[PDB]
Subunit: 206 residues, 2 copies
């Protein structure tokens, strides 16, 4: 009967938490899209979100911080890591789904919910899952209590990961992850379970 | 994108926030509750969770606090409400789904799923309508309820059936809705990160 909470990773020894974080606001500070548009820094707004996120996470025990190689993810992760004495570790498997088609067009957003991206959903989920597993594997276990790892990534890849863990097809999990939102996973080896999704309540304060 | 944000009410102006909260731990002290097991107070562990939740929400503008008539919901709501000088308001429509059969995935309850969703959605709408708008900013109402009825509401708002939203809401978790009269959108689900705070 409690094989149902073995699959829920509840009351199970050696469960780690992964706090999936969408990066903060970018496209560069809005004097104009002044810098290199291919890898923009956080905007002035995004820098403020990243501060509120880093303050909220300052109060939590944290044992590793990972990000994609995108500047906007790195800069969000760096604010978080600095509150804890951690390095940011980088993994290309956390990059956003490929959105541009090779023939010249961008990815549409059909209402139906047929998956619209040129990189297949199962590929995105597999690299995201592998990254999450590898990050936990790379983190020494917390001295007391739950090993916790922050992972800073990108909206569509994060939702694709969470939907795959929840057995929900593209667009069934009909929500948009806020910038600097926190979604918590529970991880025990290759078992991985969604605990919470999309919380950006630290943006309510300021 | 313009149409997107209108679907999700993100960037739409007159949207209110409803922070749906599962009540804190109860059935209270020991194997043997010394109290009335039909309507238990929070446990020692539940009072601690409620303190953490109250400290988390102390820094958020809040304009109203509602709960079911269950003691464990009321006591959780009271701890939140006390940080803002608010009165706890009570609505029976926020009660847990009926769990017991009159005689004694597949939806397991005698109270059908759609009725639970309807009374929960109506309660949320009525609470927002009962809250004077914020002086400046988003009007925000905390609503303390029960795990199954909360998940049924969120699933119904996302056109998911029972079991598709395959999550259990932690005790004292916060799930945020965006509300505009009859439009109502799930923005976050199940966050109990204040219980990690050392
Ligand atoms: Na940088």
């Amino acid at each position: 009967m409690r094989s149902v909470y073995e699959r829920y990773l509840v009351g199970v020894p050696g469960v780690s938490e992964v706090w999936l974080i969408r990066h903060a606001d970018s496209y560069t500070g809005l004097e104009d899209y002044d810098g290199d548009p291919r890898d923009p820094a956080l905007s002035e707004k995004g820098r403020a979100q990243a501060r509120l996120l880093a303050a909220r996470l300052a109060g939590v025990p944290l044992h590793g911080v990972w990000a994609s190689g995108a500047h906007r993810a790195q800069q969000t992760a760096s604010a978080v890591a600095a509150e804890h004495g951690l390095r940011v570790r980088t993994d290309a498997r956390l990059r956003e789904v490929r959105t541009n088609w090779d023939d010249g067009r961008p990815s549409e957003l059909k209402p139906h919910g047929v998956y619209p991206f040129p990189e297949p959903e199962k590929e995105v989920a597999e690299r995201m899952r592998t990254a999450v597993t590898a990050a936990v594997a790379a983190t020494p276990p917390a001295p007391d209590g739950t090993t916790r790892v922050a992972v800073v990534g990108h909206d569509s890849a994060l939702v694709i990961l969470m939907g795959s863990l929840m057995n929900l097809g593209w667009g069934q999990l009909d929500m948009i992850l806020p910038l600097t939102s926190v979604s918590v996973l529970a991880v025990k080896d290759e078992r991985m379970v969604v605990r919470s999704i999309g919380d950006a309540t630290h943006l309510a304060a300021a």
